[PDB]
Design a protein around this motif. Structure first.
Motif, mmCIF file in Angstrom:
data_model
loop_
_atom_site.group_PDB
_atom_site.id
_atom_site.type_symbol
_atom_site.label_atom_id
_atom_site.label_comp_id
_atom_site.label_asym_id
_atom_site.label_seq_id
_atom_site.Cartn_x
_atom_site.Cartn_y
_atom_site.Cartn_z
ATOM 1 N N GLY A 12 15.000 -27.179 25.395
ATOM 2 C CA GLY A 12 13.989 -26.293 24.846
ATOM 3 C C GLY A 12 14.330 -24.824 25.107
ATOM 4 O O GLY A 12 13.413 -24.037 25.392
ATOM 5 N N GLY A 25 8.942 -25.065 19.929
ATOM 6 C CA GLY A 25 9.664 -25.947 20.835
ATOM 7 C C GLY A 25 10.523 -25.299 21.920
ATOM 8 O O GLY A 25 11.386 -25.975 22.468
ATOM 9 N N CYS A 26 10.279 -24.019 22.231
ATOM 10 C CA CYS A 26 10.996 -23.308 23.316
ATOM 11 C C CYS A 26 10.166 -23.302 24.587
ATOM 12 O O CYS A 26 9.071 -22.769 24.615
ATOM 13 N N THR A 27 10.707 -23.867 25.665
ATOM 14 C CA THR A 27 10.023 -23.961 26.948
ATOM 15 C C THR A 27 10.471 -22.878 27.997
ATOM 16 O O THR A 27 9.800 -22.669 29.036
ATOM 17 N N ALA A 28 11.564 -22.162 27.687
ATOM 18 C CA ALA A 28 12.097 -21.105 28.553
ATOM 19 C C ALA A 28 12.990 -20.169 27.738
ATOM 20 O O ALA A 28 13.854 -20.630 26.953
ATOM 21 N N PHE A 48 5.287 -16.223 28.320
ATOM 22 C CA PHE A 48 6.171 -17.368 28.492
ATOM 23 C C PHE A 48 7.174 -17.067 29.589
ATOM 24 O O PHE A 48 7.383 -15.899 29.934
ATOM 25 N N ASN A 83 13.669 -26.426 34.039
ATOM 26 C CA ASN A 83 13.060 -27.519 33.259
ATOM 27 C C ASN A 83 13.929 -28.736 33.145
ATOM 28 O O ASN A 83 14.167 -29.258 32.037
#
Ligand code: NI
Length: 341
Positions: A12, A25-28, A48, A83
């Motif tokens: 992600g 869909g980007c977590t970092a 974020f 992550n």
């Protein structure tokens, strides 16, 4: 929308992708360094997680006012988990706090994103020596053979000698150096050192420099223009009109300006040597443009890639035109055929 070359497959993650709102869909969000084409979009309202170097995180906090809770600094040369994915940050030999990022994918793929870099043989003995790289996201700024320039050491030699001579002949001459972003600090610090002066600059620029963990920095810079015989100015003021105006401001303390404009590449690099560069002059003002690059020359880039032997290359610069894209793909093929990978 976010371009494909800013996404890291199997994760992600995105790199230097802060101007597309929320990326689905980007977590970092990783940030390689603090230059405005790269950080563009980041502000105090970003909520974020941001992963970066310590120095880059000092700048996000102090210059952009990103809130602390979203800044995740990582040390260099250290295996870290983000992550659920192993990452390493490496020194990019670009500007202070600039990194390359190694991602070790769950499936066994290894990816290097160079960020902005100036390739060096020293990189061939970092944590890169230790294992194979399948995909390379490459800083292709100067990916063409006409891009030659001298080493950083040769350029600083030329500047130190030029300033030392001018001020020794006229002790009433002022030296001025243009800046507009972090990077290229060696230019004005090396000149100040040979002249036994601190460098004077605006409060905003002084603040910026205090974020960079430069050792003994307090001994080297100041906000008192009067006490210093090397001044920094915005790059935009480094022209005859801007320099005359500034000399007016110095109250008859100086009767001559010698100025340096650190550029990247300029066409004079094809013909002329560094020894042979000459200034633009009008009256008691001289302006030198010096080719101090914090990006790979064509040869330095080629050496690095031929050493690494990646399976796939993804350019991150000059990707906007078909002719550029096609030119770069030709060089990658030559390199690969020449070296046998
Ligand atoms: Ni940059």
């Amino acid at each position: 929308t976010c371009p494909f070359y800013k996404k890291i497959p199997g994760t992600g993650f995105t790199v230097d992708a802060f101007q597309y709102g929320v990326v689905e869909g980007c977590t970092a969000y990783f940030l390689t360094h603090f230059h405005s084409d790269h950080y563009a979009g980041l502000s105090k309202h970003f909520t974020f997680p941001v992963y970066c170097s310590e120095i880059t995180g000092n700048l996000l906090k102090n210059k952009l006012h990103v809130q602390e809770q979203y800044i995740h600094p990582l040390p260099l040369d250290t295996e870290c988990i983000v992550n659920g994915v192993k990452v390493v940050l490496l020194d990019a030999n670009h500007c202070p706090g600039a990194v390359m990022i190694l991602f070790y994918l769950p499936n066994g793929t290894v990816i290097l994103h160079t960020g902005d870099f100036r390739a060096d043989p020293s990189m061939e003995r970092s944590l890169l020596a230790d294992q194979k790289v399948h995909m390379l996201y490459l800083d292709t700024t100067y990916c063409s053979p006409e891009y030659t320039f001298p080493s950083q050491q040769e350029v600083i030699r030329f500047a130190i000698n030029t300033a030392f001579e001018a001020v020794t002949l006229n002790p009433h001459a002022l030296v001025v150096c243009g800046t507009y972003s972090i990077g290229k600090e060696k230019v004005f610090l090396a000149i100040a050192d040979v002249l036994g002066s601190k460098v004077g600059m605006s409060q905003e620029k002084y603040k910026t420099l205090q974020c960079l963990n430069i050792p003994e920095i307090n001994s080297l810079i100041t906000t008192d223009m009067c006490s210093s015989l090397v001044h920094l100015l915005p790059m935009m003021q480094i022209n005859f009109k801007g320099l005359q105006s500034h000399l007016k401001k110095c109250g008859g303390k100086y009767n001559q300006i010698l100025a340096f404009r650190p550029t990247g590449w300029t066409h004079s690099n094809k013909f002329t040597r560094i020894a042979d560069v000459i200034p633009q002059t009008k009256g008691n003002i001289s302006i030198y443009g010096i080719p101090y690059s914090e990006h790979s020359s064509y040869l330095e880039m080629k050496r690095f890639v031929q050493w690494l032997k990646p399976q796939k290359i993804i350019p991150t610069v000059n990707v906007g035109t078909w002719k550029s894209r096609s030119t770069m793909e030709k060089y990658f093929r030559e390199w690969k055929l020449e070296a046998g990978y």
